[PDB]
Ligand binder design. Structure first.
Ligand SMILES: [Mg+2]
Lengths: 169, 50
């Protein structure tokens, strides 16, 4: 993306909830249920799995990103010490096998620099919000689409947001 | 016995550890504080050579 309708300076941007990272889909594991059973896969966001992932730039180091995001948006340092659980339940049809795999969702924050109404620098923070599972019913030896398993680029499973605030000097 | 003991103290990681909020107290964690008293004795010794 390029040439936004914003004045020059630095901005904190919230991109919304429901961001899943590339190549990270099945790293959490999967469950195979069958023949009328119900599978429940879930997690508890506490401690190490709640640690956010940083991607800084020369102008925007880790501390700049963290402090600006927490000043404007939800304070994730305090809120990630309180455990929060989530779960997904799916029922297999009779005489058939179902596969379900889980991957975390992230809040995507951006620190952008606008110079003459064109974004010249962008740093990105992913804060672990919750999870998201995908399921499919399969036959022995059936081919599965490559899109169900693998993700090429980071994408948002929901509608993307763009909530900007100018960082004051 | 090198003149270096605090090398394994990493200030960054320690500063990243959140504070202890929800304390589950252990009931009997202390003793009755017993003060220590001292009587100072004085000897009185005589001498002819200073
Ligand atoms: Mg807050």
């Amino acid at each position: 993306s390029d040439t936004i309708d914003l004045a020059d300076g630095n901005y904190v941007v919230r991109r919304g909830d429901g961001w899943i990272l590339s190549r990270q889909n099945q790293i959490l594991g999967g469950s195979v249920i069958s023949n009328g059973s119900t599978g429940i896969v879930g997690d508890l966001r506490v401690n190490d799995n709640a640690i956010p992932y940083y991607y800084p730039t020369p102008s925007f180091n880790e501390e700049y990103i963290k402090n600006n995001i927490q000043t404007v948006f939800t304070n994730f340092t305090e809120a990630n010490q309180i455990p929060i659980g989530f779960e997904f339940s799916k029922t297999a049809p009779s005489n058939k096998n179902l596969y379900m795999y889980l991957q975390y969702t992230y809040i995507r924050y951006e620190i952008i620099k606008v110079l003459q109404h064109e974004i010249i620098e962008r740093a990105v923070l992913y804060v672990p919000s919750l999870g998201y599972v995908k399921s499919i019913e399969f036959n022995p030896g059936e081919k599965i689409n490559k899109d169900f398993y693998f993700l090429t680029n980071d994408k948002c499973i929901l509608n993307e947001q763009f909530l900007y605030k100018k960082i004051l000097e | 016995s090198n003149d270096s003991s605090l090398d394994n103290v990493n200030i960054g990681v320690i500063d990243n550890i959140p504070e202890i909020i929800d304390v589950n107290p252990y009931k009997e964690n202390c003793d009755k504080f017993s003060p220590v008293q001292k009587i100072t004795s004085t000897r009185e010794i005589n001498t002819n050579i200073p």
